[PDB]
Symmetry: D2
Subunit: 338 residues, 4 copies
């Protein structure tokens, strides 16, 4: 009645106070992303004590005491003066939405109104402070409260809103109704060679900027897109569209035995061999039983240790799904394996 | 470039002299089955030193110095006088055929004529000492050189000849050409309720004896049948028929979350919960992704230790194919993952 | 060149930010004693990065940013309102003096003026705020800055000032010179049956209060007294007198094979078997070659895990001394084993 | 109620059948010494199941079925033809005497007449087949049944007969009475520079051959002599004489922090650093409380793994004595710690 990979992640990456630590940065940082991934994993494992401790740390240290009052700062860690505090008070909306979803599903599944209330206040603040109306698209999720919107252009991160989370949020009405449809546009229209970009810009009156560009590559952010798509229920119509769109990533992984590290989104030119977390991300995405067992072998023989936050969380998501640690319903709800 | 489950099995179950030890028996036995499984696993791991050591011990201690001269004795262990020697000189043909196949495929893949010579001499002797012509069937593989054939009846063990091995042996002509077809008959015609029996008798003029009987149950022997069927390539025409015949075993494991320990073959009534090795045996057999993931979780969280020979060898087979440790071609050859 | 027991203590008990955590208290506390023991052990291990991290945390969280400005609060942990802060701002002078000694010896051995400046300021403040003149004795070290000196009743803790630390501090003049002498009086005059008390009172015009009393027992605080005596160099003239005074503790441990949990100081009656850390504390204190080995075997076979802060630090001191992890010179300096 | 180092030694070095395996040798050998050390350790550990298993293997495979009928072959392992059998049927008298003592003390302590009968038969055969009268000495223990006694040049090994065993055997009368004395002569008269030789010759008239020679060095055999001396009871008159004779070995180890690998017995010149087993052999021998703890640290931090039979059995003897796993009485009996 435990999730062993989650138990090891707690022992190596989560402090006694409840903060998720990326040991590879010299400042030993916590991100709102890491906190939200801890909350998700604790929910899926039915680990309410860990959920509460992580939530407490998040509220006290990223949100000045309350997620009902402000979106969490995305970056926390050690300053030069030996003090540990917020390093960047801007938000990161992938952290924000995973937090809000985890809180709402914890409130529903553990029958705790407090979680529902916090997750509701959080989601409404996401809608009012990070969602904006983009001419030519409609409502769109910005990657953060500031820095991604100009007068005539906007920058988006396809990995930030999993289609299952978007489906779930539609129950709360606008703007999530529209976001479920504009998120599908973001995923399907920005992969001209079958690879989703880490980052992509949209300009008023012109559309997506898909000419070759430094951050228009499929690497560490975008590897999650394929994973989120793999996690969709087979009865979701968008799933087949999305799997067909990204088929060249699956094809590459099948032919070479590994996912690439970086893919030029405009040319489809691949470089490097992705780390173990990328192979974990391929487990829900790949549909052939044999190609899946190649990635399943690579994850099992190179399982991340304590020096690799991002490989470990990618493995929690991808290998966890591979072992039925959680599922998503047709309404985007958690179907727990408790 | 190692198979970790296999390396652990070597360290906990195989002596320095190359004998595979079942620790649960007070006589600390070795079987021809265990030796053949060790040879198979060593070939699949590309572990030629282990293979040579285990073959040496087999020839010296089970075959009085040569598998070319006699089928291996099936049971070796400690006698009451403190001496360690053969306990039963009869053969077990599942060990015999796995030995023969492993020797032939090692000769081919490692380009070593000695292995081919021993394997061919072994297979020829199997054909001449344990295969007999049964009125109503044709050539049939007996479970053992003696004790399974009377004047008008015979007793068979469906688990002994995996279809991929039978397909491989056809290349050597008769009787293996016929045995490939009569093995299918043995598997398909003795499972009236969708469950294969550990043991089943055939009487001249009467046919299969499928009335309820103590050993006409699907338990520790017959669990391998499903696994062997799961390991057939999809391009094998027999595989669809066999999967369909045994669908009630899959259906039970999907609905309940575990394979059963014992199923009455005449009624289909099932009892108990099978050990972890049975869940491993289900991994190649189950076609549903979710049911396959449930069994995968059970194998991962209850992986066999040093006190469970049979669960471990079933996990080597079942979890090893789940992780692409070996594949069988359409002609029954080893497609190695080296 | 590492100290494995210390490496394991860091991984199980010291937070990334440098706080030493006692997991057995539900508030997950840090004490000034824990911080000072971590500083000592990092110095002994030649672990300067750990030393700096622990020092930073101590200054920021126990000393409002600076050990030059105040003695550290002795108790920090989780409050009922979910925040983490000082729980009791009173000092504990055992942590204070271990911290000062460690800083001064770090300054000397690592040639860092900053450690010397902090240690000197801390030691001078200990003199000003915790040392008082007691009629009949002279200068005396109080267990803390408030609560231990009343109308005519002072309360002292014999385990607080190890004779080697007192020797080291004499280099700074008064009150440490005379203190070295009053500490000997405290140790030698309050053990009428050969056992040192956890706590003992001195009353004006009456003297030591040595009538049986709840806290006049040799238990969890006092076990350190024997250890500190065992750690004195054989060339310290006080050593032989103390070993003779405390001989009944050694005789008990030798005759019974374990140290007692609780001894009535007034009568010598012992109750219970001390935990593993008590056996580690006996290692420097014993002088036969047969009793020591018995205690060594108990520590080796019952080595503390992750749920046992006090057993673990007692083991770092006593087993670390038993493996030559540090020595004390005749002047109380660290003779490091780097 | 287990001896953890012995439990691990069984798991890594002792086969299921009960043979002690040296893994460094390509023939994976068992020696009579290894079997005797396994028997001793199992007795010390009160592991009667291991003792019986090891004794069974010893009798069946080194003594053609019975230690009552012949001394054990000293060397057993794999031949080039792949079979496993006796490699040298000559004896090694160190294994012989440890096996005899262990059987006699198992018979006495476990009240089992069978062990006494076998041990007595073995000891009387040792006297008949390996003990000879040497002009100028008297009865002497040869290192083996054949090859160590010629025209007038006998060869002896000072490490073979521990003084505690010689004391124990005196209870059986001649030749063990005088032997006890000539063994003292051998140890005290062949170390002119304070170091005992691995091997030393004696010639009629000319006496001990103590001029420098390739085998007249203190190395892997002779390291045991110091350890056996250290294991004598303090009330044995011979112990102080032997400790004084061998003072230079203790002085070297104290001054340098490690025992040497090889010492010229004629000059006292030392070379190299002895492996961890030599440090363990110094634990009973070294008499300071602070020297006995540098070596203790070296054993703790470099504890032998699975690839180091000799270091491991030296550690079982030396660290086991250091932890009170066994003691010897003034009559050479086992004082068990059970």
């Amino acid at each position: 009645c435990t999730w062993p990979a989650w138990e090891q992640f707690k022992k190596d990456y989560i402090s006694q106070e409840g903060r998720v630590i990326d040991p590879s940065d010299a400042r030993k940082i916590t991100t709102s992303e890491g906190q939200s991934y801890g909350m998700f994993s604790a929910l899926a494992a039915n680990d309410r004590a860990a959920f509460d401790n992580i939530l407490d740390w998040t509220q006290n240290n990223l949100a000045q005491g309350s997620l009902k009052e402000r979106l969490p700062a995305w970056l926390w860690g050690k300053k030069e003066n030996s003090k540990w505090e917020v390093l960047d008070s801007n938000s990161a909306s992938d952290g924000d939405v995973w937090m809000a979803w985890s809180l709402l599903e914890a409130g529903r599944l553990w029958k705790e109104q407090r979680y529902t209330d916090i997750g509701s206040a959080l989601l409404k603040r996401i809608a009012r402070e990070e969602v904006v109306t983009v001419p030519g698209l409609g409502s769109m999720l910005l990657p953060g409260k500031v820095g991604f919107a100009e007068d005539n252009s906007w920058r988006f991160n396809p990995s930030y809103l999993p289609p299952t989370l978007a489906q779930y949020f539609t129950r709360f009405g606008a703007p999530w109704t529209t976001l479920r449809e504009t998120n599908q546009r973001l995923l399907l229209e920005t992969a001209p060679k079958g690879f989703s970009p880490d980052w992509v810009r949209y300009e008023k009156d012109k559309g997506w900027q898909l000419k070759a560009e430094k951050t228009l590559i499929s690497s560490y952010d975008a590897i999650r897109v394929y994973m989120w798509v793999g996690m969709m229920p087979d009865s979701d119509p968008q799933k087949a569209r999305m799997l067909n769109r990204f088929k060249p990533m699956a094809t590459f992984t099948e032919k070479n035995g590994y996912p690439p590290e970086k893919v030029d989104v405009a040319t489809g030119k691949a470089q490097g061999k992705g780390p173990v977390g990328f192979s974990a991300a391929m487990l829900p995405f790949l549909q052939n039983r044999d190609a899946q067992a190649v990635q399943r072998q690579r994850v099992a023989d190179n399982f991340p240790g304590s020096d690799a936050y991002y490989n470990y969380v990618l493995t929690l998501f991808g290998q966890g799904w591979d072992q039925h640690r959680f599922r998503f319903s047709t309404k985007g709800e958690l179907l727990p394996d408790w």
